[PDB]
Amino acid sequence: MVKAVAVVRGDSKVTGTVTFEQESESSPTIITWDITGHDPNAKRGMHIHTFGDNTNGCTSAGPHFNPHGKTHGAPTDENRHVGDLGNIETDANGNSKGTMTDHLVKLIGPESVIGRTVVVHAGTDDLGKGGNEESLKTGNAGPRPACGVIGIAQ
Amino acid sequence: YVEMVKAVAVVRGDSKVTGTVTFEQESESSPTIITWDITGHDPNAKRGMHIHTFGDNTNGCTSAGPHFNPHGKTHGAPTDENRHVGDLGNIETDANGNSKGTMTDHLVKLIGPESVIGRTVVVHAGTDDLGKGGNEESLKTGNAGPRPACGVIGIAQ
Amino acid sequence: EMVKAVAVVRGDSKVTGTVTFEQESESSPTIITWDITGHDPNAKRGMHIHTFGDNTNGCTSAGPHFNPHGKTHGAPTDENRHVGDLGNIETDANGNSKGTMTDHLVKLIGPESVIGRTVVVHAGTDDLGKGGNEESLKTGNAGPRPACGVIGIAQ
Amino acid sequence: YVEMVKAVAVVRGDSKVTGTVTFEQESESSPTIITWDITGHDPNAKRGMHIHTFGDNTNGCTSAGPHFNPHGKTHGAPTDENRHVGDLGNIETDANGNSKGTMTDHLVKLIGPESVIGRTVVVHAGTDDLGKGGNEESLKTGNAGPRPACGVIGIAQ
Amino acid sequence: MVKAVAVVRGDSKVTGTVTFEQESESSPTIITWDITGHDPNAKRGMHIHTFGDNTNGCTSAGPHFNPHGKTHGAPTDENRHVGDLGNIETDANGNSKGTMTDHLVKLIGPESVIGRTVVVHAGTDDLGKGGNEESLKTGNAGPRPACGVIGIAQ
Amino acid sequence: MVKAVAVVRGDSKVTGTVTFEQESESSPTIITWDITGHDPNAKRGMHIHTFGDNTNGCTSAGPHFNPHGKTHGAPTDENRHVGDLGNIETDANGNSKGTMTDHLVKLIGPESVIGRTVVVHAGTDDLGKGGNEESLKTGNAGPRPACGVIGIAQ
Amino acid sequence: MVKAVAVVRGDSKVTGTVTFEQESESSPTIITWDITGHDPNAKRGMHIHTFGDNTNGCTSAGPHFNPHGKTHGAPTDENRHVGDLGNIETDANGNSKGTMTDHLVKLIGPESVIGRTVVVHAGTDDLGKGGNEESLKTGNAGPRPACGVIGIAQ
Amino acid sequence: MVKAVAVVRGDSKVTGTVTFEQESESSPTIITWDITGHDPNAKRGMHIHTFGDNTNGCTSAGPHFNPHGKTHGAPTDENRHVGDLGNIETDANGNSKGTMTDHLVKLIGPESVIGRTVVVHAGTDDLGKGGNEESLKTGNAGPRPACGVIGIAQ
Ligand SMILES: [Cu+2]
Ligand SMILES: [Cu+2]
Ligand SMILES: [Cu+2]
Ligand SMILES: [Cu+2]
Ligand code: NA
Ligand code: NA
Ligand code: NA
Ligand code: NA
Ligand code: NA
Ligand code: NA
Ligand code: NA
Ligand code: NA
Ligand code: NA
Ligand code: NA
Ligand code: NA
Ligand code: NA
Ligand code: NA
Ligand code: NA
Ligand code: NA
Ligand SMILES: [Zn+2]
Ligand SMILES: [Zn+2]
Ligand SMILES: [Zn+2]
Ligand SMILES: [Zn+2]
Ligand SMILES: [Zn+2]
Ligand SMILES: [Zn+2]
Ligand SMILES: [Zn+2]
Ligand SMILES: [Zn+2]
16 A cells, blocks of 8 residues: 655665555554675675665665664564664675565554665664664664665555 | 754755755644755856655766646745645855745655655756746756756654 | 628617627637727726626626637737627716727637627726636626627628 | 446355345535445344445455545444444344335445445345444454355446 | 546456556656457457447447547548557467557547547458448447546556 | 426525426435525535424524424535535626535425525534534524425425 | 652643553553633643653644554554544533543653653544545644643653 | 844734844845734735835835836746745634745845835735736735834844
């Protein structure tokens, strides 16, 4: 029913598209990514950050979207940010195509991620198991080579 | 909980036109204040600026689709009753190709079912004829020409 | 070919007069001449061809602007106009208006013929579809219909 | 050239509900007169009848899509200002499950850009709550239930 | 980018869908059909009839749609009805799928076929070369096993 | 079988005709109005009032015809007066032409409205949903610019 | 646990007190009102508006408190604003005493109404059933004779 | 950096403030209005009139400020009076809050509007497109329910 898309780019060669589909507010959101230009054979963090603000590049996206005030985790963790989409897997060409079904992310209602930002990170998300404050906030997934605002799609 | 919403579109595309268009709305019942700060356009020009329906940049600014038009009107001036929500008229560029301005709009909302959050600001290459051009295109797009820059309206802090 | 028509307009008003039409062939422009009296002085007044040559209820039964191409209301020179959109006539200090113009959409010959339809002289100014409201794109906000006449075949 | 338009939807579907819904409009400025002659429905019942956006029957009455809503309103009663064009309320069936009636509607048009020619009449399985149900579904569909019969609104002689 | 579709059926086993796409009023209309249940290895007339009226089955569709007042012909003829889509070719299974680009049929404007009827006929259209009055009216294409009103598609 | 008509006029420029047709006592009554001279782009109450008494203008029509002792409602409401015909819609010229099928109004039998009064009101009928006692009586539809007695038409 | 109170007044003779108690965040909030000086024998809307801002009288309270982004409805509706508390009933003297719980209004947690405003309106809330756009925003309950900021009570 | 303000009032309940700020003579002037007490849901003309003279109420403000000798127009028009600020939009409560960027109005230099008058009109400005002499002079925006002299604000 509701469809959204982020076209990500940044101060890097990482580009691509992240789409979102959600039938109703209570339904899972299906998230597809199609990323190119990343490091090969890598695990790279991908998160929804709070602000769809690109005024100062991907930095103004702010932190991970966390309406429920949880610690950073894996998508499979109960204690995760809404925006915690884990690591995407890049192939030998630095590309990553994938789909996930997310049970926290909404396109509908007060916690909608429409208008927020998808960030593809430079590093691996430690999924909140890094044992430091930074892990519980960001997963230590490194800088932000590409981001894009989640917009309404046809 | 905060009712106030701030949003920003950072616009760019296949051109030198860049800049930011900010939106602030205090409540669903209030007008939205729009501020633009555009650079790199033609000098001394009137250039159409509109909210287009889709925040989809997969095919560049073309995939933003048409003007945001939830109320099913024809294209018009911002002051017209018969206008698209997305019809913000023209911005004025100075001798350097820059445009800074601010205005409220009474149809553009950040809050509620007609929210433009996640939709697209397009800065056009030409002048919006404000639906007064006398042809069908005028009542669709204002004949404002192509889309040198666009950006998705995203939530700001 | 060489078709001539005339509407003698009157109504619930002092506005009266004659509007003549001539058309050489179906594709030719129709030459329109009006000679109107009894209107407001120094005024711009809409003059349109409305769809029906029905005067059963005064000028109201003439219906809307003649619009066989399914367009919105506009100026005569607009692409996006009704066939019946003849714009405004100008009245002089005495409330009189004489003028002539051709129109490239109005036909007396063929399927879109206006013979048997109605000329309406309106009470107000046609905004030529530029008024910025929905009514502008229907009627031009030209107001009521002080005079009308069915377009009839002339000798 | 004739301005008058007559149209008819001949409705059927995965049910015993059949019949005809005719539309007549004298001019773009006039209301449209709607006449229905429905058979095979539940007896002594109120049943929603709406114009849905698409005249697409490729997957049965589901392909007609939602209520025709060019003006971007929520679902309502025909007499409501805030209604879909397609909101024709309920028809009444008699003791035999038949419904014959006629009314004009002031939003449904056969002429002009909001023409319903080529769209779909759906006769619903349940009662239209006229947008007064207090839930989001009421403001979308009137909670009128599934679509036992539909037909494309076609031009009549 | 107007799209239309007719779903055809009638007092026969002939069913299927006929779609129409037209970019603008002056652009050609692309027509696609997907018909099943017809005679095998046959040429079968397919026309747009004037009325989208199914009150009396396919008979109520009236004659071929002919706003320009021409005689019946092949789609390639200058002198044809707007509704003259010629013959479709059915395969060994009685099925016919095809696409044509039609330079007269419109979905936009006063001659729009939206709300009119596609009829699939029982016989072969003689394309107005039958030499009788009926040929110049109907192509002698026989009865009307299936029809459907051309409706607006998403 | 029975046809009736009311020609409405009063202390105003509102005039017009309201016609009634009923095949049999249990059949719905079809009501058609053709009203001119009202406010433009407005919703205006129209009701059948009990008395076809115009001795003191539209006031002596008395209240809404309510043989079944209901509260004031919309025509669609189960709780409505027989005379509750709801709002008519006026166009940009203050004209209203419409037709409705009414399942309570009768021209035949003991609850016949023949000889009663159609009133066209000056304001909008709140349909019994105004939340005060007057709403449940009159719909708060304002004064009575025009009325006419429902007379036998054939 | 948490108790709160609004003392309402404004550009009118309407005054009074609206108290709130909530045992836990998920518990219903118990609301009691004791209002004086209103119209007699009337239904009058009473709502929690978003802002506890009285800088420009009751207008500064803004719209109905609507953190879930719904339309205006009755308290019992699924589709309602958090602040939609419907109508209070005034007696023959213009007074209204009553108590009810509400299942959406909270004093505890992120949707707390503490520091927001109770508005007693001049007219009747149509509960979102008015059939116009304003009904789905305000209930058409009219102006704001009294309001008060919801403050922590002992 | 000049700031100005007009506090408008008159023979009406229309009141409010109109502020002006301009960085330099060639810069646009930002104009903000906060108007209350007007007709609801309306378009109302707002203009700068030549004279900051209130000796005869808003009438002594004279005509639209027109130092460049143009016809009356919309703010967006080449052919407009300096004082032509077009229509403001009032909400359901008759309030209008807005901001505009005006490319002709100056607070600095010989065409300064400091000491001139903001008038809020009773009717809609036809923006010079009413087709009569008055339209090209005043926009036919009607009488002057409120006005105020533009005064230096810092
Ligand atoms: Cu991140
Ligand atoms: Cu045929
Ligand atoms: Cu009454
Ligand atoms: Cu003025
Ligand atoms: Na998951
Ligand atoms: Na949500
Ligand atoms: Na990181
Ligand atoms: Na911003
Ligand atoms: Na707004
Ligand atoms: Na919001
Ligand atoms: Na006369
Ligand atoms: Na008309
Ligand atoms: Na029909
Ligand atoms: Na109905
Ligand atoms: Na052949
Ligand atoms: Na009728
Ligand atoms: Na009824
Ligand atoms: Na809640
Ligand atoms: Na005063
Ligand atoms: Zn996180
Ligand atoms: Zn537009
Ligand atoms: Zn016209
Ligand atoms: Zn609906
Ligand atoms: Zn043919
Ligand atoms: Zn009643
Ligand atoms: Zn509410
Ligand atoms: Zn002026």
